[PDB]
Amino acid sequence: SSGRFGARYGRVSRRRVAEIESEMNEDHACPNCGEDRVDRQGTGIWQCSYCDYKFTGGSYKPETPGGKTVRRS
Amino acid sequence: GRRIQGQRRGRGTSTFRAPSHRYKADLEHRKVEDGDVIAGTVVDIEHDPARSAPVAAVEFEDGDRRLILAPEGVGVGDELQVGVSAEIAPGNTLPLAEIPEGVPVCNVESSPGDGGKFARASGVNAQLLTHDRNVAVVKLPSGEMKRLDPQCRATIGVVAGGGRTDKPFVKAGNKHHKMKARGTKWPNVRGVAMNAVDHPFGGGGRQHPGKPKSISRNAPPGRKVGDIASKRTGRGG
Amino acid sequence: TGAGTPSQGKKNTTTHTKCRRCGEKSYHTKKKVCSSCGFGKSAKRRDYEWQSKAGE
RNA sequence: CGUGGAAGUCUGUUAGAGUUGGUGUCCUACAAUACCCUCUCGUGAUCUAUGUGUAGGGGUGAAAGGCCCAUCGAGUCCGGCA
RNA sequence: GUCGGGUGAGAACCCCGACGGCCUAAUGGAUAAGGGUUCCUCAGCACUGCUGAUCAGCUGAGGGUUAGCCGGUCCUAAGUCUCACCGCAACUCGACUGAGACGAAAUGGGAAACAGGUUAAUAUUCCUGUGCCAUCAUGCAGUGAAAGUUGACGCCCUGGGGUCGAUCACGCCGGGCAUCGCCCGGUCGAACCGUCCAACUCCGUGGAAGCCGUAAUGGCAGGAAGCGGACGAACGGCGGCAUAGGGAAACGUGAUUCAACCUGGGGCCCAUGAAAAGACGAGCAUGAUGUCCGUACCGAGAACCGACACAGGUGUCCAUGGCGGCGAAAGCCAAGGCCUGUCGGGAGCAACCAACGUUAGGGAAUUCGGCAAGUUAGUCCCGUACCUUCGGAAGAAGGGAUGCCUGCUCCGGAACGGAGCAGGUCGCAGUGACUCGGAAGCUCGGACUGUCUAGUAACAACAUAGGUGACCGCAAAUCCGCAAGGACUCGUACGGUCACUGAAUCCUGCCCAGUGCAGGUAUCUGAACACCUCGUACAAGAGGACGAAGGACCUGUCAACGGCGGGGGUCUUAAGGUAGCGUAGUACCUUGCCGCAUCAGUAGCGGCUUGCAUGAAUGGAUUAACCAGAGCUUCACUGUCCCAACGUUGGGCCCGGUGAACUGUACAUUCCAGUGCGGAGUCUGGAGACACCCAGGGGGAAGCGAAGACCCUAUGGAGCUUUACUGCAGGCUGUCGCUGAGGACUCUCACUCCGGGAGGAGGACACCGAUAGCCGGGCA
RNA sequence: CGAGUGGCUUGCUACCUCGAUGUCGGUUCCCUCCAUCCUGCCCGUGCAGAAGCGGGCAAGGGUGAGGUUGUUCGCCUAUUA
RNA sequence: ACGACCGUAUAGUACGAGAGGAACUACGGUUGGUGGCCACUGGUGUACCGGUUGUUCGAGAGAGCACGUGCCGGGUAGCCA
Ligand SMILES: COC(=O)C[C@](O)(CCCC(C)(C)O)C(=O)O[C@@H]1C(OC)=C[C@]23CCCN2CCc2cc4c(cc2[C@H]13)OCO4
Ligand SMILES: [Cl-]
Ligand SMILES: [Cl-]
Ligand SMILES: [Cl-]
Ligand SMILES: [K+]
Ligand SMILES: [Mg+2]
Ligand SMILES: [Mg+2]
Ligand SMILES: [Mg+2]
Ligand SMILES: [Mg+2]
Ligand SMILES: [Mg+2]
Ligand SMILES: [Mg+2]
Ligand SMILES: [Mg+2]
Ligand SMILES: [Mg+2]
Ligand SMILES: [Mg+2]
Ligand SMILES: [Mg+2]
Ligand SMILES: [Mg+2]
Ligand SMILES: [Mg+2]
Ligand SMILES: [Mg+2]
Ligand SMILES: [Mg+2]
Ligand SMILES: [Mg+2]
Ligand SMILES: [Mg+2]
Ligand SMILES: [Mg+2]
Ligand SMILES: [Mg+2]
Ligand SMILES: [Mg+2]
Ligand SMILES: [Mg+2]
Ligand SMILES: [Mg+2]
Ligand SMILES: [Mg+2]
Ligand SMILES: [Mg+2]
Ligand SMILES: [Mg+2]
Ligand SMILES: [Mg+2]
Ligand SMILES: [Mg+2]
Ligand SMILES: [Mg+2]
Ligand SMILES: [Mg+2]
Ligand SMILES: [Mg+2]
Ligand SMILES: [Mg+2]
Ligand SMILES: [Mg+2]
Ligand SMILES: [Mg+2]
Ligand SMILES: [Mg+2]
Ligand SMILES: [Mg+2]
Ligand code: NA
Ligand code: NA
Ligand code: NA
Ligand code: NA
Ligand code: NA
Ligand code: NA
Ligand code: NA
Ligand code: NA
Ligand code: NA
Ligand code: NA
Ligand code: NA
Ligand code: NA
Ligand code: NA
Ligand code: NA
Ligand code: NA
Ligand code: NA
Ligand code: NA
Ligand SMILES: [Sr+2]
Ligand SMILES: [Sr+2]
Ligand SMILES: [Sr+2]
Ligand SMILES: [Sr+2]
Ligand SMILES: [Sr+2]
Ligand SMILES: [Sr+2]
Ligand SMILES: [Sr+2]
Ligand SMILES: [Sr+2]
Ligand SMILES: [Sr+2]
Ligand SMILES: [Sr+2]
Ligand SMILES: [Sr+2]
Ligand SMILES: [Sr+2]
Ligand SMILES: [Sr+2]
Ligand SMILES: [Sr+2]
Ligand SMILES: [Sr+2]
Ligand SMILES: [Sr+2]
Ligand SMILES: [Sr+2]
Ligand SMILES: [Sr+2]
Ligand SMILES: [Sr+2]
Ligand SMILES: [Sr+2]
Ligand SMILES: [Sr+2]
Ligand SMILES: [Sr+2]
Ligand SMILES: [Sr+2]
Ligand SMILES: [Sr+2]
Ligand SMILES: [Sr+2]
Ligand SMILES: [Sr+2]
Ligand SMILES: [Sr+2]
Ligand SMILES: [Sr+2]
Ligand SMILES: [Sr+2]
Ligand SMILES: [Sr+2]
Ligand SMILES: [Sr+2]
Ligand SMILES: [Sr+2]
Ligand SMILES: [Sr+2]
Ligand SMILES: [Sr+2]
Ligand SMILES: [Sr+2]
Ligand SMILES: [Sr+2]
Ligand SMILES: [Sr+2]
Ligand SMILES: [Sr+2]
Ligand SMILES: [Sr+2]
Ligand SMILES: [Sr+2]
Ligand SMILES: [Sr+2]
Ligand SMILES: [Sr+2]
Ligand SMILES: [Sr+2]
Numbered sequence A: 001s002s003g004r005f006g007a008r009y010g011r012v013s014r015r016r017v018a019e020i021e022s023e024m025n026e027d028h029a030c031p032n033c034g035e036d037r038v039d040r041q042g043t044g045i046w047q048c049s050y051c052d053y054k055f056t057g058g059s060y061k062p063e064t065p066g067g068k069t070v071r072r073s
Numbered sequence B: 001g002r003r004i005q006g007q008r009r010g011r012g013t014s015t016f017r018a019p020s021h022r023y024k025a026d027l028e029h030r031k032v033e034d035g036d037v038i039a040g041t042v043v044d045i046e047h048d049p050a051r052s053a054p055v056a057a058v059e060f061e062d063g064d065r066r067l068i069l070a071p072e073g074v075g076v077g078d079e080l081q082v083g084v085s086a087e088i089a090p091g092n093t094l095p096l097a098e099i100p101e102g103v104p105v106c107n108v109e110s111s112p113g114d115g116g117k118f119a120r121a122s123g124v125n126a127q128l129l130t131h132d133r134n135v136a137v138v139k140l141p142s143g144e145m146k147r148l149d150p151q152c153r154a155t156i157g158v159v160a161g162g163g164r165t166d167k168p169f170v171k172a173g174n175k176h177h178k179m180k181a182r183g184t185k186w187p188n189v190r191g192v193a194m195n196a197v198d199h200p201f202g203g204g205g206r207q208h209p210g211k212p213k214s215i216s217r218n219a220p221p222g223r224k225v226g227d228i229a230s231k232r233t234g235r236g237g
Numbered sequence C: 001t002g003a004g005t006p007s008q009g010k011k012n013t014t015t016h017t018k019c020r021r022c023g024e025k026s027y028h029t030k031k032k033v034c035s036s037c038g039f040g041k042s043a044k045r046r047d048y049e050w051q052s053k054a055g056e
Numbered sequence D: 001c002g003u004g005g006a007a008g009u010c011u012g013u014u015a016g017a018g019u020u021g022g023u024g025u026c027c028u029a030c031a032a033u034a035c036c037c038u039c040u041c042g043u044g045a046u047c048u049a050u051g052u053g054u055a056g057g058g059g060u061g062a063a064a065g066g067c068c069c070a071u072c073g074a075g076u077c078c079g080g081c082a
Numbered sequence E: 001g002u003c004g005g006g007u008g009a010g011a012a013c014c015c016c017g018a019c020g021g022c023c024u025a026a027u028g029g030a031u032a033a034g035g036g037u038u039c040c041u042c043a044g045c046a047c048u049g050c051u052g053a054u055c056a057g058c059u060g061a062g063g064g065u066u067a068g069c070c071g072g073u074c075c076u077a078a079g080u081c082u083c084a085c086c087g088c089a090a091c092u093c094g095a096c097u098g099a100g101a102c103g104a105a106a107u108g109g110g111a112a113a114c115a116g117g118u119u120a121a122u123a124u125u126c127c128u129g130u131g132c133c134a135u136c137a138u139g140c141a142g143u144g145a146a147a148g149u150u151g152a153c154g155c156c157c158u159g160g161g162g163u164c165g166a167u168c169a170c171g172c173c174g175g176g177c178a179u180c181g182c183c184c185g186g187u188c189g190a191a192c193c194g195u196c197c198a199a200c201u202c203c204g205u206g207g208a209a210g211c212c213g214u215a216a217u218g219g220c221a222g223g224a225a226g227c228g229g230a231c232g233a234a235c236g237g238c239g240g241c242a243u244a245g246g247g248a249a250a251c252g253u254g255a256u257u258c259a260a261c262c263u264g265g266g267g268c269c270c271a272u273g274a275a276a277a278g279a280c281g282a283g284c285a286u287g288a289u290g291u292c293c294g295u296a297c298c299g300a301g302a303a304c305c306g307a308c309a310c311a312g313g314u315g316u317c318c319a320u321g322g323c324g325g326c327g328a329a330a331g332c333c334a335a336g337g338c339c340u341g342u343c344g345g346g347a348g349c350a351a352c353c354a355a356c357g358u359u360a361g362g363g364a365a366u367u368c369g370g371c372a373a374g375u376u377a378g379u380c381c382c383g384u385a386c387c388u389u390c391g392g393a394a395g396a397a398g399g400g401a402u403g404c405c406u407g408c409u410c411c412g413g414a415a416c417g418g419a420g421c422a423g424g425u426c427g428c429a430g431u432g433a434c435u436c437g438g439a440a441g442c443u444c445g446g447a448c449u450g451u452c453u454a455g456u457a458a459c460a461a462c463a464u465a466g467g468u469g470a471c472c473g474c475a476a477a478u479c480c481g482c483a484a485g486g487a488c489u490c491g492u493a494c495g496g497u498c499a500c501u502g503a504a505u506c507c508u509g510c511c512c513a514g515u516g517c518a519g520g521u522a523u524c525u526g527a528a529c530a531c532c533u534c535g536u537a538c539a540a541g542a543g544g545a546c547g548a549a550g551g552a553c554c555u556g557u558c559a560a561c562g563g564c565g566g567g568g569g570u571c572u573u574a575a576g577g578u579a580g581c582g583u584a585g586u587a588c589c590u591u592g593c594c595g596c597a598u599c600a601g602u603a604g605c606g607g608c609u610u611g612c613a614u615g616a617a618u619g620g621a622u623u624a625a626c627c628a629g630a631g632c633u634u635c636a637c638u639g640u641c642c643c644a645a646c647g648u649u650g651g652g653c654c655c656g657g658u659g660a661a662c663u664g665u666a667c668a669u670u671c672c673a674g675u676g677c678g679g680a681g682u683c684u685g686g687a688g689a690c691a692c693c694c695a696g697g698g699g700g701a702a703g704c705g706a707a708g709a710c711c712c713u714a715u716g717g718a719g720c721u722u723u724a725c726u727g728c729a730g731g732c733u734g735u736c737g738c739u740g741a742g743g744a745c746u747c748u749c750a751c752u753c754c755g756g757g758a759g760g761a762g763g764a765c766a767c768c769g770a771u772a773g774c775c776g777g778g779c780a
Numbered sequence F: 001c002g003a004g005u006g007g008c009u010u011g012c013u014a015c016c017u018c019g020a021u022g023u024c025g026g027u028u029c030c031c032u033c034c035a036u037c038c039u040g041c042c043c044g045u046g047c048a049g050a051a052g053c054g055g056g057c058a059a060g061g062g063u064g065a066g067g068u069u070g071u072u073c074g075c076c077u078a079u080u081a
Numbered sequence G: 001a002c003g004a005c006c007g008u009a010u011a012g013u014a015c016g017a018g019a020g021g022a023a024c025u026a027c028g029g030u031u032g033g034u035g036g037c038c039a040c041u042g043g044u045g046u047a048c049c050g051g052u053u054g055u056u057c058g059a060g061a062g063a064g065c066a067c068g069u070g071c072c073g074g075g076u077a078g079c080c081a
Helices: A011-022 B005-009 B172-179 C005-010
Strands: A038-040 A045-048 A054-056 B039-048 B053-060 B065-069 B079-081 B093-095 B104-106 B126-130 B136-139 B145-148 B153-156
Touching (some): A045 B039, B039 B065, B079 B093
Antiparallel strands (some): A038 A045, A045 A054, B039 B079, B053 B065, B093 B153, B104 B126, B104 B153, B126 B136
């Protein structure tokens, strides 16, 4: 997904952008319903195209490893 | 010589100032007397230009539209409670005494009623550990054990926008855009690349610092550059 | 671009204008201060001892 | 295979910005920094008008001691001063 | 520009016609700033105008700018000022906090105007016609009235609606051309009032288990399609406006592509894309009121800035005129403008110079160097290496095609859109002009885009992402201020400050002795105040006790400054150079030795390499991609060269007119020798020498230009450095004052901070005032 | 070992110029010197011849093209009387 | 205002065991320099004639512009090597 960067920047810079944007444009499960319709609106802002649920998550992930630890306690 | 860059900073000129007029809200906790009967519904999720993380727009029972520091997993429609008898749910604000041990908390107050000072940046959190009648020990994002007053309010959950630091800027242009939204002069010219008149490390036929980089705490502004009061330097050892 | 003749072409800004107080073309219309009499800066008229030789 | 149309992406005298070589022309100049051809950038850290801010051992500086009205390793004016 | 002609005492350049040209994002049209009367008329030529002038931006005299609805005015933006408060020795000074005001004329927001006519000069301002807005008054309606909506918004891609324009078809009116029958122009008509509504959203019906839909994404039993309905757009259509206006006349109709304008869908952000006044919400009649300021003209190769009628500089809108073609490209031509990038006449017009064309054979032999020039070129088809970060390299390279004419096929609703087929046919040449890459390889550097010495440096330098270390929990770290206070900060460690290194990949050895920083410290050293001894009827003063930071001492630390040798089979001073790389942009010797390539190679590349004096974030190595960066090789090409020629345009030369400057002790027709402060037109000896003028290229006048920038000298200057001398800020630390109650401790009442408040935290500390010790090129 | 000539190298001196006599190399154009490289005429020879070596007179003419290097210098190639 | 070289005859001769190998003289040419000239070859030749691309004058005919010839082909005189 980093073909827009061409022959520039190097491995790590365009490999880590590819991994992070692949797990961002991916189909994510919604906290309201259960549908895989959550897309990114901006930095940290997420929304489901089904029930119009606009929520807060990580910058590139809708759920961070630390955000899942809050549910435990 | 001429005053160094760090000295021009304090004068507070345009180049060094934050674009305050383009900022949204001073994210503080609400002022409740005693009673807890203050709750509200989340209307929108907005982007905060000051911290590059999301901020939740909440409308309270008494009709007050205020922007609050959004934790992770808070959406439109969700009900948030602020007060002493508040529910132990993510996104609720209640004093450290009422919050159970081992629960990740954010937007912690230093002195009770200040509105929140600690654990405010993207994805970070403070960990509440020990309880007492006098003190509440909170472990701040740096790993420091901060002894605080149990009457200091805090919001449950980790701050939203986690993992921001994980993706590289890739290009100078992306940095440019981030920096235009902060109170920072960017790009950074190395002192070692300057003239002697401009910086203590300036001058020479080649680029290297003058004296050693580790400077004393007692050093005056204009000389305090490089490694400020370093306990040690390097990686090894 | 040269600092001389080619940089003189951009000069179409009005700064110094006829003053309400003294009549000199020294009222800076952007600063709202007169460079000659001090109108806009002081109630007292701008005067200095260096405008003449020391013993005069 | 198609669709899609990303990009400090490419060609480009589009507008616009810049200024590599000719060490050409000029060098009592058209001009106290000009002319011509050539050359570089041209969706971005882009270019630009106007308004506005920072002032002299001070600013401003992607740093050349660059720039702060033809004035800068400390502007200009007058005074100290014959 | 030329031929006629006009006016005039006078005409190359003032005016008329004709002919011939120039300008096409401008040399046209409208404007911002800035100018300030430069605008129009009349009269003039002393001034100004690169010549002349009857002309004029010149001289003189008159005249000229008309607004409810175009701007200002009103609103708020970054931000500015005023007052109060506080600071300051003080103020015309100074940060905060309050309140008030100011801050947008092209180009932020915003109540309302269109069409025509008229002047020498104004014009949405005057006049005619028509329309619109706001306020107020009266009358009718209405009791709703403030919630909400609007004002009001980023970048990229894109659909739909749609006007002007442009073009096509056909008709009408007028013109042009005259083998044809083609070619040009026109065919009009506003604001406003009324009306229509696509998209979006939503409601009812319906009942899809796979269908609906798009350029694309997409949609759905949480209810798809289909059907009906609510809400709802254009500066658009339609009707009025209009037996208004305009036109000599006709006074059209359809279409395509469609700027403006309207309305949707999608994507991006470690970037999140104004505010306020105002409007809507919230009817209608009639009447009244609508003041104040701007309004001329230029807006530039003559009205602005640059001393100038300066080849410079200077913002906005017209980006849809025709052919052309991908095109807002070239080239050509309209509309419109101009012959004022304003001196002319003459000589086949010499030398020489500037721009330039063409040169046989050779083909880089030229030169530091292919500098300069040239070669290549558009489009389609075929085809395409090493290497690589798999993106790229790549238009690699290389090869073929390319016009016109006749008749057609395919894609699409169609284009005056595109892709092809068959036959015919012309030239040396079909991207026929124009437009339009020369190609390949090796090496060095910096990863890349980007930045820079305004005016000799664009680079390898700066920046950059990336790597790393340092400081700080916020009453912080860092920084500004004398103070009151302030930046960072509408910020909080995934932060932001201070530094180093400089993409990726493989890596980053050893050394803490010196220096720096930091931690610790029995003991030693360590100021002042207070305390004790001596001294003095007191005081000066001498000594003692106690002892803070700091120092000694110990430890930690090199991605901290830096270091990584000599000798022998350890010594200095801690270690003794590991991976790598290596005759390097570092190698003195040096053109190192071997090889490659050439006839010949101080070059270049590979290998070796004892490295005068490589080497690991003073980062080492390596590297795809990128480059107006340095060096080298090959193909191609050529006037760079052999070696020069002819030609073209502007000068040069002669004539009319206009008309400077540099320079000048005097004398001066010199030449060869000599002499002289040793580098003489002038002295000495000889030689030569009739005067004046024209053109030339520059040998001499140690030519002209600049009181040498090199060098030295001066008890000269300045910038910069530091373990130079002396001091000054600043930080740390003790002590005294604020400062209180009961060598360690409790408290609360000053004082500080948090809290709107109640009240909470801290607390005689901190802050502040004073003094003392330490550090202290930050500064003098 | 001894005696000299020159004024191309280098060194020495500090006379001339610091109110400036434009620095190397190259190029282009002109004149000159002889201590002659070739060419003309000669003498000797370890001169058969051929080709040379050495010397004398002699400055009329000639003394060229190229590869590395900024180079002067020099190294190298093929031509040349 | 001429300098120099190569070649042929001399001659496979003189000389020399052989290998090798001349000269006087007479001739032909080349090179460098020099002065002049254009019949010949060559260059130029924005005189001229032709072809042809774009655009404008309606087509045709005939023309303008495309840098001082749009480009391409040929090229007289003169001037030249
Ligand atoms: C160190 O060399 C220089 O400084 C050259 C220059 O600066 C040239 C000046 C040229 C000007 C500006 C006068 O045109 C200069 O003044 O030279 C002097 C100069 O300038 C007139 C001439 C001098 C004076 C004696 C003769 N010589 C000739 C040139 C020259 C050359 C030099 C030299 C000195 C001279 C002087 O050092 C070695 O190279
Ligand atoms: Cl950052
Ligand atoms: Cl106006
Ligand atoms: Cl759509
Ligand atoms: K001198
Ligand atoms: Mg806040
Ligand atoms: Mg980082
Ligand atoms: Mg900024
Ligand atoms: Mg930097
Ligand atoms: Mg520097
Ligand atoms: Mg320097
Ligand atoms: Mg310094
Ligand atoms: Mg470095
Ligand atoms: Mg360094
Ligand atoms: Mg500005
Ligand atoms: Mg007149
Ligand atoms: Mg007018
Ligand atoms: Mg003029
Ligand atoms: Mg030739
Ligand atoms: Mg040569
Ligand atoms: Mg070139
Ligand atoms: Mg079809
Ligand atoms: Mg090299
Ligand atoms: Mg670079
Ligand atoms: Mg420069
Ligand atoms: Mg450059
Ligand atoms: Mg960095
Ligand atoms: Mg970093
Ligand atoms: Mg660098
Ligand atoms: Mg080598
Ligand atoms: Mg290291
Ligand atoms: Mg001097
Ligand atoms: Mg000097
Ligand atoms: Mg000094
Ligand atoms: Mg406070
Ligand atoms: Mg100093
Ligand atoms: Mg001279
Ligand atoms: Mg002799
Ligand atoms: Mg001679
Ligand atoms: Na694809
Ligand atoms: Na240029
Ligand atoms: Na560049
Ligand atoms: Na100063
Ligand atoms: Na004239
Ligand atoms: Na309408
Ligand atoms: Na067109
Ligand atoms: Na670029
Ligand atoms: Na050490
Ligand atoms: Na080293
Ligand atoms: Na030529
Ligand atoms: Na001369
Ligand atoms: Na100085
Ligand atoms: Na001698
Ligand atoms: Na020379
Ligand atoms: Na001779
Ligand atoms: Na040579
Ligand atoms: Sr607060
Ligand atoms: Sr706060
Ligand atoms: Sr330095
Ligand atoms: Sr280490
Ligand atoms: Sr300006
Ligand atoms: Sr003032
Ligand atoms: Sr005074
Ligand atoms: Sr680009
Ligand atoms: Sr140059
Ligand atoms: Sr010129
Ligand atoms: Sr010049
Ligand atoms: Sr040229
Ligand atoms: Sr480009
Ligand atoms: Sr003086
Ligand atoms: Sr105009
Ligand atoms: Sr006259
Ligand atoms: Sr006029
Ligand atoms: Sr105002
Ligand atoms: Sr406006
Ligand atoms: Sr359309
Ligand atoms: Sr006008
Ligand atoms: Sr101009
Ligand atoms: Sr210029
Ligand atoms: Sr015309
Ligand atoms: Sr004139
Ligand atoms: Sr020809
Ligand atoms: Sr060459
Ligand atoms: Sr060469
Ligand atoms: Sr080809
Ligand atoms: Sr610049
Ligand atoms: Sr790296
Ligand atoms: Sr140490
Ligand atoms: Sr080694
Ligand atoms: Sr002359
Ligand atoms: Sr000087
Ligand atoms: Sr002689
Ligand atoms: Sr001889
Ligand atoms: Sr020499
Ligand atoms: Sr040598
Ligand atoms: Sr013979
Ligand atoms: Sr024989
Ligand atoms: Sr012509
Ligand atoms: Sr061509």
